[PDB]
mmCIF file of C-alpha atoms in Angstrom:
data_model
loop_
_atom_site.group_PDB
_atom_site.id
_atom_site.type_symbol
_atom_site.label_atom_id
_atom_site.label_comp_id
_atom_site.label_asym_id
_atom_site.label_seq_id
_atom_site.Cartn_x
_atom_site.Cartn_y
_atom_site.Cartn_z
ATOM 1 C CA UNK A 23 107.097 -207.323 26.201
ATOM 2 C CA UNK A 24 103.863 -208.093 28.103
ATOM 3 C CA UNK A 25 101.874 -207.394 24.920
ATOM 4 C CA UNK A 26 104.256 -209.763 23.096
ATOM 5 C CA UNK A 27 103.879 -212.527 25.712
ATOM 6 C CA UNK A 28 100.045 -212.240 25.522
ATOM 7 C CA UNK A 29 100.045 -212.457 21.668
ATOM 8 C CA UNK A 30 102.213 -215.606 21.869
ATOM 9 C CA UNK A 31 99.922 -217.256 24.436
ATOM 10 C CA UNK A 32 96.761 -216.433 22.440
ATOM 11 C CA UNK A 33 98.293 -217.690 19.127
ATOM 12 C CA UNK A 34 99.395 -220.995 20.547
ATOM 13 C CA UNK A 35 95.954 -221.461 22.161
ATOM 14 C CA UNK A 36 94.256 -220.830 18.786
ATOM 15 C CA UNK A 37 96.437 -223.337 16.879
ATOM 16 C CA UNK A 40 91.084 -229.018 13.585
ATOM 17 C CA UNK A 41 94.130 -230.694 15.016
ATOM 18 C CA UNK A 42 91.796 -233.354 16.393
ATOM 19 C CA UNK A 43 90.016 -233.610 13.049
ATOM 20 C CA UNK A 44 93.228 -234.213 11.122
ATOM 21 C CA UNK A 45 94.303 -236.780 13.676
ATOM 22 C CA UNK A 46 90.991 -238.602 13.306
ATOM 23 C CA UNK A 47 91.381 -238.674 9.509
ATOM 24 C CA UNK A 48 94.812 -240.264 9.868
ATOM 25 C CA UNK A 49 93.573 -242.697 12.539
ATOM 26 C CA UNK A 50 90.823 -243.932 10.147
ATOM 27 C CA UNK A 51 93.403 -245.101 7.555
ATOM 28 C CA UNK A 52 93.313 -248.849 7.184
ATOM 29 C CA UNK A 53 96.260 -251.015 8.379
ATOM 30 C CA UNK A 54 97.128 -251.979 4.752
ATOM 31 C CA UNK A 55 98.670 -248.534 4.138
ATOM 32 C CA UNK A 56 101.361 -249.069 6.837
ATOM 33 C CA UNK A 57 101.967 -252.841 7.043
ATOM 34 C CA UNK A 58 104.082 -254.136 4.231
ATOM 35 C CA UNK A 59 103.540 -257.840 5.285
ATOM 36 C CA UNK A 60 99.952 -257.560 4.025
ATOM 37 C CA UNK A 61 100.967 -256.821 0.365
ATOM 38 C CA UNK A 62 100.793 -260.493 -0.402
ATOM 39 C CA UNK A 63 96.977 -260.157 -0.320
ATOM 40 C CA UNK A 64 97.217 -257.931 -3.398
ATOM 41 C CA UNK A 65 96.995 -260.301 -6.385
ATOM 42 C CA UNK A 66 95.624 -258.071 -9.179
ATOM 43 C CA UNK A 67 96.077 -254.524 -10.461
ATOM 44 C CA UNK A 68 92.573 -253.382 -9.497
ATOM 45 C CA UNK A 69 93.269 -254.129 -5.844
ATOM 46 C CA UNK A 70 96.763 -252.595 -6.112
ATOM 47 C CA UNK A 71 95.331 -249.413 -7.560
ATOM 48 C CA UNK A 72 92.710 -249.079 -4.803
ATOM 49 C CA UNK A 73 95.428 -249.389 -2.132
ATOM 50 C CA UNK A 74 97.785 -247.118 -4.061
ATOM 51 C CA UNK A 75 95.222 -244.276 -3.943
ATOM 52 C CA UNK A 76 94.774 -244.765 -0.228
ATOM 53 C CA UNK A 77 98.557 -244.798 0.300
ATOM 54 C CA UNK A 78 98.970 -241.544 -1.666
ATOM 55 C CA UNK A 79 96.346 -239.812 0.452
ATOM 56 C CA UNK A 80 98.043 -241.098 3.579
ATOM 57 C CA UNK A 81 101.457 -239.679 2.528
ATOM 58 C CA UNK A 82 99.888 -236.216 1.941
ATOM 59 C CA UNK A 83 97.875 -236.283 5.184
ATOM 60 C CA UNK A 84 100.837 -237.318 7.313
ATOM 61 C CA UNK A 85 103.315 -234.912 5.699
ATOM 62 C CA UNK A 86 100.919 -231.951 6.173
ATOM 63 C CA UNK A 87 100.142 -232.908 9.684
ATOM 64 C CA UNK A 88 103.734 -233.642 10.702
ATOM 65 C CA UNK A 89 104.741 -230.221 9.393
ATOM 66 C CA UNK A 90 101.940 -228.595 11.422
ATOM 67 C CA UNK A 91 102.927 -230.433 14.601
ATOM 68 C CA UNK A 92 106.650 -229.653 14.153
ATOM 69 C CA UNK A 93 105.846 -225.940 13.749
ATOM 70 C CA UNK A 94 103.794 -226.001 16.933
ATOM 71 C CA UNK A 95 106.700 -227.520 18.851
ATOM 72 C CA UNK A 96 108.877 -224.666 17.594
ATOM 73 C CA UNK A 97 106.309 -222.094 18.792
ATOM 74 C CA UNK A 98 106.241 -223.840 22.203
ATOM 75 C CA UNK A 99 109.993 -223.817 22.612
ATOM 76 C CA UNK A 100 109.887 -220.096 21.735
ATOM 77 C CA UNK A 101 107.131 -219.438 24.307
ATOM 78 C CA UNK A 102 109.122 -221.366 26.915
ATOM 79 C CA UNK A 103 112.118 -219.055 26.285
ATOM 80 C CA UNK A 104 109.818 -215.971 26.535
ATOM 81 C CA UNK A 105 108.383 -217.222 29.830
ATOM 82 C CA UNK A 106 111.805 -217.785 31.392
ATOM 83 C CA UNK A 107 112.923 -214.277 30.343
ATOM 84 C CA UNK A 108 109.661 -212.663 31.579
ATOM 85 C CA UNK A 109 109.889 -214.497 34.918
ATOM 86 C CA UNK A 110 113.527 -213.291 35.491
ATOM 87 C CA UNK A 111 112.432 -209.665 34.785
ATOM 88 C CA UNK A 112 109.459 -209.939 37.194
ATOM 89 C CA UNK A 113 111.724 -211.200 39.977
ATOM 90 C CA UNK A 114 113.917 -208.140 39.547
ATOM 91 C CA UNK A 115 110.963 -205.771 39.467
ATOM 92 C CA UNK A 116 109.457 -207.451 42.527
ATOM 93 C CA UNK A 117 112.562 -207.016 44.684
ATOM 94 C CA UNK A 118 112.910 -203.405 43.586
ATOM 95 C CA UNK A 119 109.308 -202.709 44.596
ATOM 96 C CA UNK A 120 109.784 -204.455 47.962
ATOM 97 C CA UNK A 121 112.726 -202.147 48.669
ATOM 98 C CA UNK A 122 110.667 -199.095 47.616
ATOM 99 C CA UNK A 123 107.728 -199.992 49.876
ATOM 100 C CA UNK A 124 110.083 -200.079 52.887
ATOM 101 C CA UNK A 125 111.410 -196.629 51.929
ATOM 102 C CA UNK A 126 107.910 -195.202 51.602
ATOM 103 C CA UNK A 127 106.847 -196.675 54.962
ATOM 104 C CA UNK A 128 109.850 -194.956 56.506
ATOM 105 C CA UNK A 129 108.932 -191.708 54.671
ATOM 106 C CA UNK A 130 105.346 -191.877 56.019
ATOM 107 C CA UNK A 131 106.749 -192.422 59.538
ATOM 108 C CA UNK A 132 108.869 -189.260 59.212
ATOM 109 C CA UNK A 133 105.880 -187.225 57.987
ATOM 110 C CA UNK A 134 103.857 -188.577 60.930
ATOM 111 C CA UNK A 135 106.648 -187.532 63.282
ATOM 112 C CA UNK A 136 106.411 -184.002 61.798
ATOM 113 C CA UNK A 137 102.610 -183.974 62.163
ATOM 114 C CA UNK A 138 102.899 -184.980 65.827
ATOM 115 C CA UNK A 139 105.631 -182.497 66.645
ATOM 116 C CA UNK A 140 103.917 -179.625 64.802
ATOM 117 C CA UNK A 141 100.796 -180.100 67.044
ATOM 118 C CA UNK A 142 103.055 -179.367 69.958
ATOM 119 C CA UNK A 143 105.127 -176.625 68.248
ATOM 120 C CA UNK A 144 102.081 -174.632 67.217
ATOM 121 C CA UNK A 145 101.169 -174.112 70.916
ATOM 122 C CA UNK A 146 104.394 -172.211 71.521
ATOM 123 C CA UNK A 147 103.580 -169.671 68.713
ATOM 124 C CA UNK A 148 101.582 -166.432 68.482
ATOM 125 C CA UNK B 23 94.833 -221.551 32.616
ATOM 126 C CA UNK B 24 96.154 -219.547 29.649
ATOM 127 C CA UNK B 25 93.130 -217.287 29.848
ATOM 128 C CA UNK B 26 93.876 -216.869 33.611
ATOM 129 C CA UNK B 27 97.564 -216.069 33.001
ATOM 130 C CA UNK B 28 96.599 -213.446 30.402
ATOM 131 C CA UNK B 29 94.054 -211.750 32.729
ATOM 132 C CA UNK B 30 96.732 -211.533 35.429
ATOM 133 C CA UNK B 31 99.342 -210.042 33.044
ATOM 134 C CA UNK B 32 96.909 -207.438 31.642
ATOM 135 C CA UNK B 33 95.694 -206.375 35.135
ATOM 136 C CA UNK B 34 99.156 -205.921 36.545
ATOM 137 C CA UNK B 35 100.177 -203.983 33.406
ATOM 138 C CA UNK B 36 97.294 -201.521 33.815
ATOM 139 C CA UNK B 37 98.451 -200.317 37.316
ATOM 140 C CA UNK B 38 102.003 -199.246 36.266
ATOM 141 C CA UNK B 39 101.362 -195.790 34.764
ATOM 142 C CA UNK B 40 99.219 -194.748 37.771
ATOM 143 C CA UNK B 41 102.089 -195.969 39.984
ATOM 144 C CA UNK B 42 104.873 -193.828 38.533
ATOM 145 C CA UNK B 43 102.646 -190.740 38.679
ATOM 146 C CA UNK B 44 101.862 -191.206 42.375
ATOM 147 C CA UNK B 45 105.543 -191.760 43.099
ATOM 148 C CA UNK B 46 106.379 -188.412 41.358
ATOM 149 C CA UNK B 47 103.749 -186.662 43.506
ATOM 150 C CA UNK B 48 105.401 -188.021 46.638
ATOM 151 C CA UNK B 49 108.867 -187.003 45.350
ATOM 152 C CA UNK B 50 107.616 -183.382 44.996
ATOM 153 C CA UNK B 51 106.798 -183.100 48.660
ATOM 154 C CA UNK B 52 109.055 -180.439 50.200
ATOM 155 C CA UNK B 53 111.680 -181.176 52.930
ATOM 156 C CA UNK B 54 109.638 -179.464 55.599
ATOM 157 C CA UNK B 55 106.904 -182.166 55.648
ATOM 158 C CA UNK B 56 109.441 -184.884 56.580
ATOM 159 C CA UNK B 57 112.208 -183.193 58.655
ATOM 160 C CA UNK B 58 111.161 -182.346 62.151
ATOM 161 C CA UNK B 59 114.452 -180.438 62.853
ATOM 162 C CA UNK B 60 113.227 -177.678 60.510
ATOM 163 C CA UNK B 61 110.139 -176.816 62.646
ATOM 164 C CA UNK B 62 112.269 -174.159 64.332
ATOM 165 C CA UNK B 63 111.811 -172.057 61.147
ATOM 166 C CA UNK B 64 108.035 -171.846 61.861
ATOM 167 C CA UNK B 65 107.559 -168.709 63.977
ATOM 168 C CA UNK B 66 103.856 -167.888 63.569
ATOM 169 C CA UNK B 67 100.575 -169.788 63.609
ATOM 170 C CA UNK B 68 99.690 -168.957 60.037
ATOM 171 C CA UNK B 69 102.863 -170.603 58.707
ATOM 172 C CA UNK B 70 102.276 -173.521 61.111
ATOM 173 C CA UNK B 71 98.712 -173.992 59.850
ATOM 174 C CA UNK B 72 99.874 -173.882 56.192
ATOM 175 C CA UNK B 73 102.470 -176.579 56.899
ATOM 176 C CA UNK B 74 99.986 -178.596 58.937
ATOM 177 C CA UNK B 75 97.565 -178.719 55.957
ATOM 178 C CA UNK B 76 100.411 -179.856 53.676
ATOM 179 C CA UNK B 77 101.528 -182.478 56.209
ATOM 180 C CA UNK B 78 97.962 -183.862 56.389
ATOM 181 C CA UNK B 79 97.811 -184.156 52.566
ATOM 182 C CA UNK B 80 101.186 -185.915 52.593
ATOM 183 C CA UNK B 81 100.049 -188.451 55.242
ATOM 184 C CA UNK B 82 96.956 -189.330 53.172
ATOM 185 C CA UNK B 83 98.947 -189.630 49.928
ATOM 186 C CA UNK B 84 101.658 -191.861 51.463
ATOM 187 C CA UNK B 85 99.183 -194.052 53.380
ATOM 188 C CA UNK B 86 97.029 -194.642 50.286
ATOM 189 C CA UNK B 87 100.042 -195.333 48.145
ATOM 190 C CA UNK B 88 101.676 -197.697 50.654
ATOM 191 C CA UNK B 89 98.414 -199.737 50.793
ATOM 192 C CA UNK B 90 98.256 -199.782 46.964
ATOM 193 C CA UNK B 91 101.877 -200.851 46.630
ATOM 194 C CA UNK B 92 101.554 -203.650 49.201
ATOM 195 C CA UNK B 93 98.564 -205.035 47.253
ATOM 196 C CA UNK B 94 100.541 -204.850 44.025
ATOM 197 C CA UNK B 95 103.419 -206.826 45.586
ATOM 198 C CA UNK B 96 100.899 -209.511 46.491
ATOM 199 C CA UNK B 97 99.656 -209.569 42.856
ATOM 200 C CA UNK B 98 103.253 -209.892 41.625
ATOM 201 C CA UNK B 99 104.178 -212.725 43.900
ATOM 202 C CA UNK B 100 101.022 -214.451 42.666
ATOM 203 C CA UNK B 101 101.894 -213.856 39.013
ATOM 204 C CA UNK B 102 105.410 -215.170 39.682
ATOM 205 C CA UNK B 103 103.837 -218.373 41.053
ATOM 206 C CA UNK B 104 101.503 -218.623 38.068
ATOM 207 C CA UNK B 105 104.473 -218.237 35.689
ATOM 208 C CA UNK B 106 106.508 -220.967 37.372
ATOM 209 C CA UNK B 107 103.495 -223.325 37.289
ATOM 210 C CA UNK B 108 102.674 -222.471 33.653
ATOM 211 C CA UNK B 109 106.305 -223.015 32.608
ATOM 212 C CA UNK B 110 106.407 -226.472 34.287
ATOM 213 C CA UNK B 111 103.116 -227.394 32.521
ATOM 214 C CA UNK B 112 104.496 -226.252 29.115
ATOM 215 C CA UNK B 113 107.609 -228.392 29.612
ATOM 216 C CA UNK B 114 105.326 -231.436 30.192
ATOM 217 C CA UNK B 115 103.124 -230.646 27.213
ATOM 218 C CA UNK B 116 106.177 -230.097 25.024
ATOM 219 C CA UNK B 117 107.683 -233.501 25.819
ATOM 220 C CA UNK B 118 104.322 -235.209 25.251
ATOM 221 C CA UNK B 119 104.040 -233.549 21.842
ATOM 222 C CA UNK B 120 107.633 -234.483 20.980
ATOM 223 C CA UNK B 121 106.732 -238.118 21.684
ATOM 224 C CA UNK B 122 103.628 -237.866 19.485
ATOM 225 C CA UNK B 123 105.510 -236.326 16.586
ATOM 226 C CA UNK B 124 108.018 -239.208 16.679
ATOM 227 C CA UNK B 125 105.104 -241.648 16.451
ATOM 228 C CA UNK B 126 103.658 -239.850 13.376
ATOM 229 C CA UNK B 127 107.093 -239.644 11.706
ATOM 230 C CA UNK B 128 107.387 -243.390 12.251
ATOM 231 C CA UNK B 129 103.872 -243.851 10.789
ATOM 232 C CA UNK B 130 104.824 -241.860 7.694
ATOM 233 C CA UNK B 131 107.993 -243.947 7.323
ATOM 234 C CA UNK B 132 105.908 -247.117 7.358
ATOM 235 C CA UNK B 133 103.513 -245.731 4.766
ATOM 236 C CA UNK B 134 106.505 -244.720 2.629
ATOM 237 C CA UNK B 135 107.850 -248.256 2.929
ATOM 238 C CA UNK B 136 104.478 -249.631 1.748
ATOM 239 C CA UNK B 137 104.339 -247.148 -1.127
ATOM 240 C CA UNK B 138 107.796 -248.120 -2.310
ATOM 241 C CA UNK B 139 107.171 -251.810 -2.010
ATOM 242 C CA UNK B 140 103.745 -251.622 -3.691
ATOM 243 C CA UNK B 141 105.311 -249.858 -6.707
ATOM 244 C CA UNK B 142 107.541 -252.824 -7.074
ATOM 245 C CA UNK B 143 104.790 -255.397 -6.285
ATOM 246 C CA UNK B 144 102.538 -253.961 -9.007
ATOM 247 C CA UNK B 145 105.151 -254.856 -11.676
ATOM 248 C CA UNK B 146 104.902 -258.569 -10.812
ATOM 249 C CA UNK B 147 101.106 -258.603 -11.404
ATOM 250 C CA UNK B 148 99.310 -259.420 -14.646
#
């Protein structure tokens, strides 16, 4: 459970992103603004933009998939954290109860130690 | 933050085996170290001295364990706080990332619109 929660936290940390984002950011506005198509008046220009558009579709699809998967991992971690927190609360209150019991036990043993110091004087 | 939460979880985990073992040692103490009404059964000094040695060991074991356990409760309350804080931070990060994904889905939909329209525009060209 603890081992599982650690693996999840490490994985998420290790899942580059910034590089793919920068690649997408560097796309020119002509790939996403259909009002600019009127500037295309020959097939050479159309073909240049078409290549750029194709790359953009691949980059965004790959990246959107990656991001969506990370959200899923985060929702899963969130569920694991809530469950682990509820279990720790229960363990904590159990241990609080136990510490009181052991303090009482030590006080009884101390009472025996004290009373034995006196009892031993009455013996041969 | 994540690195800190991991260190805390590992540390706390490491204590637990040592804990159960010390608790078993305390459980094996005999009734005579904790029940003063039974002292009446001690009728010579040799028996008294044997019990006195055992009682001293018990006092040391319980005192050391009670100090250990109190420190562990502190560590657990701290971990509990760290978990609540980390959970709240993950909720915030999650909603930020949800927003960003919507923006990139919208961007892809625009690019798809351009692609479609360019395929058609190309047919009108010489």
